[PDB]
Amino acid sequence: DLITLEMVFAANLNQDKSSCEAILPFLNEYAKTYGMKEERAMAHFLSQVGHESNFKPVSENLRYSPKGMRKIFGCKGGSKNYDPILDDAKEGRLRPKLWTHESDYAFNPVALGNYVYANRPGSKNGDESSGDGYKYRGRGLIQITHKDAYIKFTEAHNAANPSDQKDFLASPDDILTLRYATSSAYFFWFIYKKSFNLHSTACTGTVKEVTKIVNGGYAGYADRLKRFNAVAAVIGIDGARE
């Protein structure tokens, strides 16, 4: 194989061996069909996937308390503008129904997701009554979210795996299976972020630079680097100081 159990276990910080064993065949199947051949890129991929997911598929949790949903989804400019003391937005309520229609959205993942992800720019989600917001919530290993990602994953997975045609608009929960969570990770890597040259950057770049593309930021940077070096060691590749 291109990916051994020891690489996956190392990317998983030597935890949950059986989760690593369960996902190993899909990891190898889709590295072949999507074209993961380069070893330094693979070490970045395993370390980024391991940090995001620990190789277990995850679905976004949209069950929030009243204050919790206001903090994360209610304020213009995001949570940085939540005033905990006032339970209010510092620079304007972006989603005012989280205040006036509190009981409709708190602890109601379907209603909340349909409201807070409605009409998101670039996302192809329709309005609150379309059901797009909850339906295309985050799923996978590196989570993909919103209608646009599920369109693009459908086309990308079918292009790379023509003998296993799927429709993740019709069946979005399949991304919670190990098989299509793994396919979606490779789609993220090679297709979804192609315009940022994620794969190229992993080939000759830095953990920090890979992290910037994957995360849109530097969240969990130190842990992603720790995982990469552990993978580099098992492979025989130079580690990374950055």
Numbering used by the authors: 5 to 246
Show passages lifted from the paper:
Here, we report that a T6SS effector TseP, from Aeromonas dhakensis, represents a family of effectors with dual amidase-lysozyme activities. Our previous findings have established that TseP serves a structural role because its expression can restore the T6SS secretion in the Δ3eff mutant lacking all three effector genes, and the C-terminal domain, TsePC, possesses lysozyme activities. This study unveils that TsePN is capable of cleaving the peptide link between NAM and L-Ala as an amidase. TsePN, the N-terminal domain, functions as a Zn2+-dependent amidase, while the C-terminal domain, TsePC, exhibits lysozyme activities.
The crystal structure revealed that TsePC comprises a smaller lobe of seven helices and a larger lobe of ten helices, separated by a concave groove. The electropositive surface of TsePC consists of residues R723 and K796, with an adjacent residue Y720 corresponding to W62 in lysozyme, altering which is known to affect substrate binding. Although this structural arrangement resembles that of other lysozyme family members, TsePC exhibits a less compact conformation with a notably wider groove compared to the typical lysozyme. To test the effect of E663 for TsePC activity, we purified a mutant E663D (TsePC-E663D) protein and perform PG-digestion assays. The results show that TsePC-E663D lost the activity, suggesting the greater distance within the groove requires this glutamate residue.
